[PDB]
């Protein structure tokens, strides 16, 4: 079966390198959707593999718009036209760390494999999301219509989906994954980057922004330097 990827994004260019990590380490991905209301980045060319999806292109209710809430977008991913039944969802600060097999995320029979959750791309199914929207209609409607991140939001992609799919026999934990968290605003976190670049060992890593102690100028220099070396191949959708 096909497997697509959806990134959420709002305007270092972390997304450029997150997309390089897919091009390098998940070549089996079919379509990449960028769910965003921002102007596309200037480095991004038109390419058959990339589709920009504004909120108005997939939300059930236009009253919910405009939105500034990633949770609202996340509650409506399964309405993206053309999206495959099996897909991954990611933020722009989540990176594939080394070559991945599709079975890291989906069994050959379609069971999703979630990493217990860790801050990584998550595997989802459109049909299961349709089912949860039908079973929790007030929560899906309210979250889609919540213009800012709220305690009332259902946390579909990072928790609720996986618990629902676990209990109904459609998801199982991924016990075999190595994940590194890098706080890029601390010196201890930035010290992880040369060790990660040199020695690898991780299927996934993520670049967090903490109360920073690293000045913004130094953080950008060290992070961009790391990403340029770790992901040196420009993807075919880059100008």
UniProtKB/Swiss-Prot annotation:
Name of the protein: Exopolysaccharide phosphotransferase CpsY
Family affiliation: Belongs to the stealth family.
Section covered of the full-length record: 201 to 510 of 532
Organism: Mycobacterium tuberculosis (strain ATCC 25618 / H37Rv)
Anything else known: Stealth proteins are part of a protein family that is conserved from bacteria to higher eukaryotes. Family members were first identified in microbes as proteins that help pathogens to elude the host innate immune system. Microbial stealth proteins are involved in the biosynthesis of exopolysaccharides. Stealth proteins are predicted to function as hexose-1-phosphoryltransferases.
Gene name linked to the record: cpsY
């Amino acid at each position: 079966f096909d497997i697509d990827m959806v990134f959420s994004w709002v305007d270092i260019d972390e997304l450029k390198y997150a997309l390089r990590s897919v091009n390098m380490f998940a070549p089996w991905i079919r379509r990449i959707f960028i769910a965003t209301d921002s102007t596309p980045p200037p480095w991004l060319a038109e390419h058959p593999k990339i589709t920009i999806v504004r909120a108005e292109d997939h939300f059930s209710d236009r009253s919910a718009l405009p939105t500034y809430n990633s949770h609202a977008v996340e509650s409506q991913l399964h309405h993206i036209p053309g999206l495959s039944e099996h897909f991954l969802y990611s933020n722009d600060d989540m990176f594939f760390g080394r070559p991945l097999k599709a079975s890291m995320f989906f069994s050959p029979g379609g069971v999703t494999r979630f990493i217990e959750l860790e801050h990584t791309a998550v595997p989802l199914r459109k049909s299961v999301l349709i089912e949860m929207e039908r079973e929790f209609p007030e929560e899906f409607a309210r979250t889609a219509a919540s213009p800012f991140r709220s305690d009332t939001d259902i946390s579909v992609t990072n928790s609720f989906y996986h618990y629902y799919a676990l209990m109904t026999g459609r998801a199982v934990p991924q016990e075999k994954a190595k994940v590194l968290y890098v706080d890029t605003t601390s010196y201890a976190g930035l010290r992880l980057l040369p060790k990660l670049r040199k020695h690898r060992g991780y299927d996934f890593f993520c670049l967090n922004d903490g109360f920073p102690e690293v000045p913004a100028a130094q953080r950008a220099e060290r992070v961009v330097s790391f990403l340029e070396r770790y992901f040196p191949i420009p993807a075919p959708w880059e100008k």
